[PDB]
Amino acid sequence: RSLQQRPEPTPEEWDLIHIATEAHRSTNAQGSHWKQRRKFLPDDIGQSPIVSMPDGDKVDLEAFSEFTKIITPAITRVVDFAKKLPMFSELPCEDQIILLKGCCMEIMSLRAAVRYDPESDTLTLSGEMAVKREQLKNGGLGVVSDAIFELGKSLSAFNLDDTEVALLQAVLLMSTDRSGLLCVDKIEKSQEAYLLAFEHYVNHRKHNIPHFWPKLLMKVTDLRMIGACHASRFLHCKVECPTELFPPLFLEVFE
Numbered sequence: 001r002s003l004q005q006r007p008e009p010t011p012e013e014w015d016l017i018h019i020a021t022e023a024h025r026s027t028n029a030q031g032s033h034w035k036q037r038r039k040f041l042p043d044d045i046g047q048s049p050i051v052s053m054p055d056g057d058k059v060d061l062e063a064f065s066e067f068t069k070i071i072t073p074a075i076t077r078v079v080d081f082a083k084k085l086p087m088f089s090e091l092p093c094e095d096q097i098i099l100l101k102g103c104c105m106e107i108m109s110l111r112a113a114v115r116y117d118p119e120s121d122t123l124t125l126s127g128e129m130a131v132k133r134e135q136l137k138n139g140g141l142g143v144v145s146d147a148i149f150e151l152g153k154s155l156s157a158f159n160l161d162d163t164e165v166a167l168l169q170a171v172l173l174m175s176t177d178r179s180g181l182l183c184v185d186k187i188e189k190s191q192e193a194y195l196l197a198f199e200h201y202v203n204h205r206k207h208n209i210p211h212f213w214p215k216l217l218m219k220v221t222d223l224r225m226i227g228a229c230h231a232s233r234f235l236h237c238k239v240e241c242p243t244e245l246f247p248p249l250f251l252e253v254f255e
């Protein structure tokens with residue numbers, strides 16, 4: 001360890017890595033059998049954008065409905081992921097709440113993006129619903145969909161395993177650029193530990209791409225950006241459409 005040229009995970013990092021990975025696996029829909037269980041979203045759904053949005057990319061109500069009918073269990077599984085992480089569970093529940101809201105979209109988007117299928121040109125939502133670029137964009141997301149598609153297409157070269165996704169999620173979670181946090185230092189400290197463990201795991205993996213780590217960290221920024229666009233776009237939807245169309249937990253996370 002450190003053994004070939006680049007530092008390997010420490011024993012303490014191996015532990016943190018194992019805990020994060022299992023946290024992700026146990027909360028990640030349809031594990032390694034998503035390619036056989038997924039049903040495509042019918043091609044007549046997603047083609048009819050008619051509710052206006054401030055930026056001019058309209059919303060298709062039927063598609064919004066399809067995506068939001070399945071969103072609660074998806075958000076629920078991100079809450080579940082976070083809770084299996086000891087540095088998350090031991091925070092005040094105020095802090096817990098703020099962190100989940102700050103990273104929910106980021107983690108859900110990542111999870112869809114790692115399930116980008118090149119041959120059909122689709123993302124898989126919750127390991128069960130394979131969607132095209134147009135359907136997802138028209139259903140609410142607008143250009144955020146082009147962003148997750150663009151991220152998913154570029155990640156196929158990266159060959160991320162379950163651990164790098166889990167650690168990516170954990171770094172997205174433990175982030176201090178949110179308003180209203182109590183335990184700011186404990187969070188930074190916990191993020192730093194994941195980042196280092198992450199880096200050293202990437203070292204252990206020996207990817208065939210040069211400069212893998214900074215390339216990966218740049219994919220982090222893309223997610224945060226996807227996250228911030230969605231929070232802008234969510235706010236506009238809440239303005240255009242009635243409450244009744246939004247599942248209580250969807251509202252609770254993004255409102």
Ligand SMILES: N[C@@H](Cc1cc(I)c(Oc2ccc(O)c(I)c2)c(I)c1)C(=O)O
Pocket residue numbers: 029064067068070071074077108109111112113124125126127139140141148234
């Ligand atoms: N693929 C994920 C779950 C996941 C689910 C859904 I519904 C998604 O579409 C969204 C999200 C937000 C919105 O505001 C709208 I409208 C749509 C995405 I991107 C991801 C997983 O495996 O957990």
